[PDB]
Design a protein around this ligand. Structure first.
Ligand SMILES: CC(=O)N[C@@H]1[C@@H](O)[C@H](O[C@@H]2O[C@H](CO)[C@H](O)[C@H](O)[C@H]2O[C@@H]2O[C@@H](C)[C@@H](O)[C@@H](O)[C@@H]2O)[C@@H](CO)O[C@@H]1O
Ligand SMILES: CC(=O)N[C@@H]1[C@@H](O)[C@H](O[C@@H]2O[C@H](CO)[C@H](O)[C@H](O)[C@H]2O[C@@H]2O[C@@H](C)[C@@H](O)[C@@H](O)[C@@H]2O)[C@@H](CO)O[C@@H]1O
Lengths: 309, 309
């Protein structure tokens, strides 16, 4: 009826980026999800381009922090007073769960904390870890804590950046017990309810499962669970944001096509609120050809039955 | 006609990513470049979607390395035997300058070197630096060297990744003398000339300068030069690669529009071989509205006269 035609990118899975951590996608995965709550806040976008949760457009700002730091005496810990994505004042009253790009899982994220002194352009960088399950993790309040390897090198009142690399685990405890990718941090700290969240998703149609876009996070210490599943590639977020094509039903039928043959491998539902389901029962690593890609074919309804994956 | 209509993304500058290092764009910059060679190898793509140089599609696989490492006795240095993205051996006979995403400047890039032991999922991470001007920097031959902070923690024959964060400088020497963003590394080391390069670019038309998409690399030690200019945002590379719209002339005329007024701020030439020029003489940080964007207007020839920026 004259709506702007909806499309998805023709990039292959391996040509795209995880929307929950700045690393490439590796594979597609489906499994049952009744045993956990699927409520990530990064990689959330409606098909007509409305960003949700803490989702923002940059693949390299995910799980980053910016601001200035204060040393906590008697430790190697620094409190970062957060700034916005472009180094302006952070506004805690904005109707979002936390600063855009904030991590959306409980875990210990390791990276580098870097700093420049404005006056002379001197710089410094130190390995640092943020414990997103810890009491000082209060990004919505404008404050997070980093554990570092220095007690004096960082200066006050100078622009400071955290660049994430990977995750760690406490090797004296049960292996792969953290990170917990489906447990949201408490963005305002212990026992304070989160706000303005993108909703939890579940396959609501009988016989369906979520389809996840999966990567493996680097591990930096211990025995971490390095699996990371997102609902939408970052490139799909960027694509929908720009196109802003209106959803003509609750569900977009996508076909996964092998361009080498022109043949469809499977079909799936892209729900207009921004997640994908498939008709399958059980945990399964999808085996796909390297040049395979998703193609929008038609608008269907909540009552459409998918061909079994 | 019926040729596929050419477009550029409507993402704003601050919503896009530098194509030469995994950091957000900050600003537009123009300056004279007649006195030196502008020949970056990342962020090189024709308007009809042909990747050039060492350019690849991922915003987060730029200046990364992966492979396995060997310890150099009596040092904290490790040699990395490079692998491809899916962990097979790099093939030096491919007609490219170096593995795709290899750094295209001479400098000391600091980040974290991480590793997983496959047998038990144990992991480890250490601050590391690669000096792309050094004799062991031979990515085209399949080998680079890292300086780290350990002499024994990394294991042999285990998958190892370098994630870049920023750059350093030797603070006992002249400030901001490195990195040198317009000096290409020697991809095969000492005394071997580089091959299969994307060409140098220059404005030919009187009164014109290159328009650069600029970021500030994090600094991790010393007094580095942190300016980093690319010719095309990474998102434009991804866009042209997917669209593959044929060039109807040598130059796509773009207008940069201010939505708050509906008026054009400036116009520029996007050359079909993948770079932008503007009519200006001198160094200038462009002042743009946060919601400003580029819009393709028409195909013109190389000798079209732009309104002064
Ligand atoms: C039972 C038990 O505690 N296991 C230990 C494990 O804790 C050790 O890991 C080191 O622990 C320290 C803290 O005391 C740091 O967290 C180190 O980063 C960590 O080493 C890293 O992870 C381990 C699993 C190895 O992969 C190592 O190469 C990494 O540097 C280890 C140290 O050898 O011993 C027992 O496994
Ligand atoms: C005059 C002069 O040489 N300046 C020194 C400066 O070089 C020192 O910096 C350190 O140098 C060592 C190498 O010997 C390492 O590279 C350190 O990382 C480096 O410190 C870092 O950069 C300096 C400029 C500071 O920003 C510092 O905070 C960083 O950690 C310093 C040491 O403090 O002394 C003189 O400034």
């Amino acid at each position: 009826t004259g709506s702007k035609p909806f499309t998805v990118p023709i990039l292959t899975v391996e040509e795209m980026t995880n929307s929950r951590f700045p690393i490439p996608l590796e594979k597609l995965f489906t499994g049952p999800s009744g045993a956990f709550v699927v409520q990530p806040q990064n990689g959330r976008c409606t098909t007509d381009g409305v960003l949700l949760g803490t989702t923002q457009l940059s693949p390299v700002n995910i799980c980053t922090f910016r601001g200035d730091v204060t040393h906590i005496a008697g430790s190697r810990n620094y409190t970062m007073n957060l700034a916005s994505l472009n180094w302006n004042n952070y506004d805690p009253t904005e109707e979002i769960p936390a600063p855009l790009g904030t991590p959306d899982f409980v875990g210990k994220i390791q990276g580098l904390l870097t700093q420049t002194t404005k006056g002379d352009g001197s710089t410094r960088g130190h390995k640092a870890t943020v414990y997103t399950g810890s009491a000082p993790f209060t990004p919505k309040l404008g404050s997070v804590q980093f554990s570092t390897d220095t007690e004096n090198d960082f200066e006050t009142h100078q622009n400071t950046k955290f660049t994430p690399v990977g995750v760690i685990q406490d090797g004296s405890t049960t292996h792969r017990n953290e990170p917990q990718q489906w447990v949201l941090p408490s963005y305002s700290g212990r026992n304070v309810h989160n706000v303005h969240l993108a909703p939890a998703v579940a396959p609501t149609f009988p016989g369906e499962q979520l389809l996840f876009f999966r990567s493996t996070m680097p591990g930096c210490s211990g025995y971490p669970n390095m699996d990371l599943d997102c609902l939408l590639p970052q490139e799909w977020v960027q694509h929908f944001y720009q196109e802003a094509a209106p959803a003509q039903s609750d569900v977009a039928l996508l076909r996964f096509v092998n361009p080498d043959t022109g043949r469809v491998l499977f079909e799936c539902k892209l729900h207009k609120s921004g997640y994908v389901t498939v008709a399958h029962t059980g945990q399964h690593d999808l085996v796909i050809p390297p040049n395979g890609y998703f193609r929008f074919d038609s608008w269907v309804n909540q009552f459409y039955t998918l061909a079994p994956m």
